[model samples]
Target: EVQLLESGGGLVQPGGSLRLSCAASGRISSIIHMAWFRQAPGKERELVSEISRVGTTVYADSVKGRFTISRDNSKNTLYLQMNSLKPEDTAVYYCNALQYEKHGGADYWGQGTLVTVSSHH
Candidate 1:
């Protein structure tokens, strides 16, 4: 079984940056690709980015150039880095992944971290 724990998110100012982390436990070697998703306050969830085992990355148009995804094999961790953030980016961020050579479903999730980008409304 694989479980993830998210950390490193809190109230941040607009135009700032944040790095969120997801630590994985159990069968980390089975993981092939990881993806990030976020749900804005009172809004629906959406895909933000994904990273492959080969170190390739892709980002949704909504977050293009502002968000990046990476992995740390040494720590069994995944990271979501965001820059030039906005109030619109305030949301609960989640991490999930696809794995092979393992027994179970492809979708395992992190506990999630709430990012609050302070804004002037």
Candidate 2:
């Protein structure tokens, strides 16, 4: 069986940086792709980035410049790091494991962590 649990999200200031984590259990090395997604306040969701078993990473156009996805093979963990945070970046972030069939999308999902960006001024 496979399971994914996410952590590391909370209030962040605009223009700051944040890093989220996802700890996976089971045969993660066999998983072809790991992805990061976020759901906005209104519930609209988007795929922010992804990493392959071969170590290649691809990011969505919207996050190309500010988001990075990486993995720790030995730890079976995935990470999502973002910089230049903005208020609009506030959302619930989820980590997904693409399993079963290619293009079938995520088979296991984390409960999600809320990341909120606010301005001091």
Candidate 3:
């Protein structure tokens, strides 16, 4: 089974950027792609984007700006970035391994990081 570990937290001011890292371990060879999701309080989770270790990436239409994904193949770590944050961007973010044969849903996920956005600096 594959497992994901994530790190980072705390409130961020508007216009600030934050990066969260997701590391995978335990029989990860079956993982073909990594995807990110965001779930705001009481709202449904949204697919932010996905990337493969081969260096290809895909993004959801609604996530044109303010999000980026990168990976270090050697370390098996995926990095997610949310930049130029706004109050509406506060949410819990997760890193997941995509299971295409299983309906394109996340088969495994990290614990997630809670991010709060505010105008206060």
Candidate 2, residues 59-79, lDDT tens digits: the string is: 979778888888776788899
User: Across residues 2-22, which tens digit of lDDT does each residue of candidate 1 receive?
Assistant: 788899899889999999999
Give the residue spans of candidate 2 off by over 4 A.
27-29, 101-106
Task: Estimate, for each residue in 1-121, the C-alpha lDDT of model 3 and write its tens digit.
Answer: 5789988656899888888889988766554788888899878998888997677888767656777888876888998887887787788888898654444444788999888999864
What's the CA error at residue 13 for candidate 2, in Å?
0.6
C-alpha TM-scores of all predictions: 0.88, 0.88, 0.85
* Poorest stretch of ten by lDDT in candidate 3: 98-107
Task: Please list the C-alpha lDDT of all candidates, in the order they appear.
Answer: 0.85, 0.85, 0.81
Clash totals for all models, in order? 0, 0, 0
Report the Cα RMSD per candidate.
2.1, 2.6, 2.7
**Candidate 2 global TM-score:** 0.88
Report the Cα lDDT for candidate 3. 0.81
lDDT of 2 at 92: 94
